[PDB]
């Protein structure tokens, strides 16, 4: 009827096919156009107006031919004077609409029956306006096909003779009007009426008489209606009612037997009561053969055990957001088919161990945001079907061992934000004791969430018994140290463990022969103890197990020492990782880097004539760096001096040594920086000893004569060993020694 072809055509109003529809704009060049038709052929057509006087309808597109359409929607339109709206629909070429929606705040007048001539065939009509406007009761005349009605014009009261020809009306929507009273004698004219939405009115004092003849009615909504209290028979004529809604009201109490005559109930909802409703009367939902869904939120303080007595059909219950301190034990005795209890946000401190005794089919339980304090052993000993469970943000401290033995149906377990520690003594931990958390029996478990607790150990069961585990959250606990066994998760199922923000101050990884583990934000100390970890962090170390887990470490930062502090783990270099040796000589700071097994001794005080007593080298260590730079030594100790005897490196630059015996040098020596000393001559026995040995020799008063001849040949060939050959000087005038021959010195 109307497609892309008509769209392209000029110059009337411009059309432009967008998405799958067409956005016609009249006029074609107007900023704020008079009309903005939006046509989606066969389906609907929205007419968006912007009119001053009613005479603007001329600028409508001429000869449009939209053909058949199910839904017509008019927004911001002038009521068309003394002209049927169906005229405008004819002008645009629309044929047989099923729905007309009139929704404006610029009407120009009041709605009249004449507007609705030729739209008697309608099935759905909606009229909405926030103007002050009166609606005539002769408006819906000859509307035999109207099945859905909705009017919203701040309607203060509606006279019965409106619904005269509405014989086929099944559903009524009059929310956000001002109805102060239910129209009498109306259900007789509408024998097929099923939905009766009367929310957001003023329907205060309703009464048993107000529903006489409404045995056709299934759903009645009266929420947001200031209702302070209801007569115990208000619904007594509503015999086959299935959906009530008493929400947003003002109940302080309810009469017993309130639903006694309506044993076809399928869902009652009393949500968000604008004032505190202490409790529900006895047997309020008892003896209800079809009752399923329920929603209660009125800041309830307590409940009767017989509240759901014999109502063995209930499937969902929302008792969330109340003030329940506890529950009676029998409350769910008969609720065999219950599927989802939800006691979120209460002051629940304990739930009688027999509460979920019979609730054999229970699947989702929610208990988060209460003052629960521990899981007993019988409380869940029947919930083999319970698939996912929440107790987040309570004060759980004591999960019984026998607690989770029968819950083989569980997959998602959230006990985050509690005070659970699993009571583990730290000494069984250090001694790698194979012991299980009470979650042990749940092999097929998928989600564990112990965030913001006080776990101090990665328990045995979560690595080897839970192979299906996909989601593990141990962030914000109190784990102080990891070992390579704390990263051994036997899960072939995309496991992502979160260990952020704990107390992990060290990570003991060894050199040895798919699970993601976040380790960001930790009090890691960066001493020699965490050596292999840093190598592993970079490409360096990859000791077998490494490839079977994938560490996230991008925000792991050294807390101590103050040198490396503030710096990430991939950045640092393993020679900084030193562990202070306390034994060490006075005036000398010492440390050990396990990067090269090197015992370093820094005695850079500047006041030593002797080499101070040196601590022995471990039979594991390999390097010993006696750093005695810029002092005033005099002589060196023997090679047999203990501690000293294991030295590999001897950094004595800037000292006072005048002669070096070949016995004053250590067996394990490999470096020998005797730069800047008092040495004038080195015997030929020393030079044989220096056969790899890096050596430094410059800055000494070298007496170059015939007795220096050996040394002069040493330098001349041992180029690699001596870093400062070109800097070695003579004192017989001074000239560089590398400017000398073995004959300038030797006749």
């Amino acid at each position: 009827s109307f497609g892309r072809d008509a769209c392209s055509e000029d110059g009337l109003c411009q059309c432009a096919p967008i998405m799958s529809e067409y956005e016609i704009i009249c006029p074609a060049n107007a900023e704020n156009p008079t009309f903005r038709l939006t046509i989606q052929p066969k389906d609907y057509v929205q007419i968006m107006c912007n009119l001053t006087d009613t005479t603007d309808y001329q600028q409508l597109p001429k000869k449009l031919r939209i053909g058949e359409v199910d839904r017509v929607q008019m927004r911001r339109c002038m009521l068309p004077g003394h002209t049927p709206i169906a005229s405008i629909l004819d002008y645009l070429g629309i044929v047989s609409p099923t729905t007309l929606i009139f929704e404006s705040d610029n009407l120009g007048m009041n709605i009249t029956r004449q507007h609705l001539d030729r739209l008697h065939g309608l099935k759905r009509f909606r009229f909405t306006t926030r103007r002050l406007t009166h609606i005539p009761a002769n408006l819906l005349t000859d509307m035999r096909n109207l099945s859905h009605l909705e009017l919203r014009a701040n309607i203060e009261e509606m006279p019965s003779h409106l619904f005269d020809d509405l014989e086929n009306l099944e559903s009524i929507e009059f929310g956000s009007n001002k109805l102060r009273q239910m129209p009498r004698g109306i259900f007789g004219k509408m024998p097929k009426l099923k939905q009766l939405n009367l929310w957001s009115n003023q329907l205060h004092n309703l009464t048993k008489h107000d529903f006489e003849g409404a045995t056709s009615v299934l759903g009645i909504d009266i929420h947001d209606n200031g209702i302070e209290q209801l007569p115990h028979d208000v619904f007594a004529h509503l015999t086959n009612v299935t959906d009530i809604n008493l929400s947003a009201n003002l109940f302080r109490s309810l009469p017993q037997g309130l639903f006694d005559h309506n044993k076809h109930l399928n869902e009652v909802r009393l949500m968000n009561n604008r004032v505190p409703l202490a409790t529900l009367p006895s047997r309020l939902f008892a003896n209800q053969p079809e009752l399923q869904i329920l929603r209660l939120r009125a800041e309830l303080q307590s409940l009767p055990g017989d509240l759901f007595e014999h109502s063995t059909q209930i499937t969902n219950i929302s008792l969330g957001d109340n003030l329940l301190k506890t529950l009676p034990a029998t409350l769910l005795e008969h609720q065999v088919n219950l599927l989802s209890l939800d006691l979120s946000n209460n002051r629940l401190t304990h739930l009688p161990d027999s509460l979920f005794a019979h609730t054999t089919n229970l699947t989702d339980l929610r208990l988060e945001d209460n003052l629960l304090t521990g899981i007993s052993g019988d409380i869940f000993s029947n919930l083999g079907n319970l698939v996912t469970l929440v107790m987040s943000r309570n004060r759980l401290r004591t999960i019984d061992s026998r607690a989770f033995v029968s819950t083989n149906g569980l997959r998602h377990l959230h006990l985050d934000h509690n005070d659970i520690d699993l009571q583990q003594p730290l000494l069984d931990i250090m001694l790698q004791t194979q012991i299980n958390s009470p979650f042990g029996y749940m092999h097929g478990l998928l989600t564990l969430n112990l965030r913001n607790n006080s776990i101090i150990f990665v328990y045995n069961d979560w690595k080897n018994t839970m192979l299906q585990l996909r989601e593990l959250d141990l962030s914000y606990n109190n784990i102080s140290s990891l070992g390579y066994e704390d990263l051994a998760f036997l899960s072939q199922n995309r496991l992502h463990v979160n260990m952020t923000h704990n107390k992990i101050r060290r990570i003991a990884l060894p050199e040895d022969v798919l699970v993601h583990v976040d380790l960001n934000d930790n009090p890691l100390v960066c001493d020699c103890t965490i050596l292999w970890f840093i190598q592993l962090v970079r490409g360096v170390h990859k000791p077998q197990y490494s490839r079977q887990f994938k560490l996230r470490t991008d925000r792991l930062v050294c807390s101590q020492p103050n040198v490396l502090e503030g710096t990430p783990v991939r950045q640092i270099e393993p020679q900084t990782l030193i562990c202070p040796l306390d034994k060490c000589p006075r005036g000398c700071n010492c440390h050990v880097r396990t990067y090269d097994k090197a015992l370093v001794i820094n005695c850079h005080s500047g006041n030593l004539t002797h080499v101070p007593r040196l601590p022995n080298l471990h039979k594991n260590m390999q390097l010993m760096e006696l750093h005695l730079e810029n002092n005033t030594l005099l002589r060196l100790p023997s090679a047999n001096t203990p501690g000293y005897e294991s030295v590999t490196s001897l950094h004595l630059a800037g000292n006072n040594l005048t002669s070096i015996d070949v016995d004053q040098l250590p067996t394990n020596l490999t470096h020998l920086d005797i730069s800047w000393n008092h040495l004038q001559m080195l015997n030929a026995t020393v030079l044989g000893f220096l056969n790899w040995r890096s050596v430094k020799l410059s800055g000494n008063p070298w007496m170059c004569d015939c007795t220096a001849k050996p040394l002069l040949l040493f330098t001349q060939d041992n180029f690699e060993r001596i870093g400062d050959r070109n800097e070695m000087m003579c004192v017989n005038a001074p000239t560089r020694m590398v400017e000398l021959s073995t004959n300038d010195i030797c006749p």
Binding site: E23, D70, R71, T98, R274
Partner: protein, 65 residues
């Protein structure tokens, strides 16, 4: 099907080298529709969302995520 109309909480106006289809809040900070059952605290208000350029208009409750 027939009369398969869907009702949004916030009314808005979908309008248009190349033009761009946007959606813009009919009113600024108008209360949301069907918002009678949300708690007294949530105070539902209509908000304007962008993509800078308008994209759609959503109702916005005041609570936790």
């Amino acid at each position: 099907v027939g009369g398969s109309d869907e009702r949004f909480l916030c009314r808005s106006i979908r309008k248009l080298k190349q033009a761009i289809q946007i959606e813009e809040c009919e009113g600024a900070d108008q209360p949301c529709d069907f918002a009678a059952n949300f708690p007294q605290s949530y105070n539902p208000i209509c908000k304007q969302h962008y993509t800078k350029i308008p994209s759609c208009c959503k109702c916005a409750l005041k609570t936790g995520l």
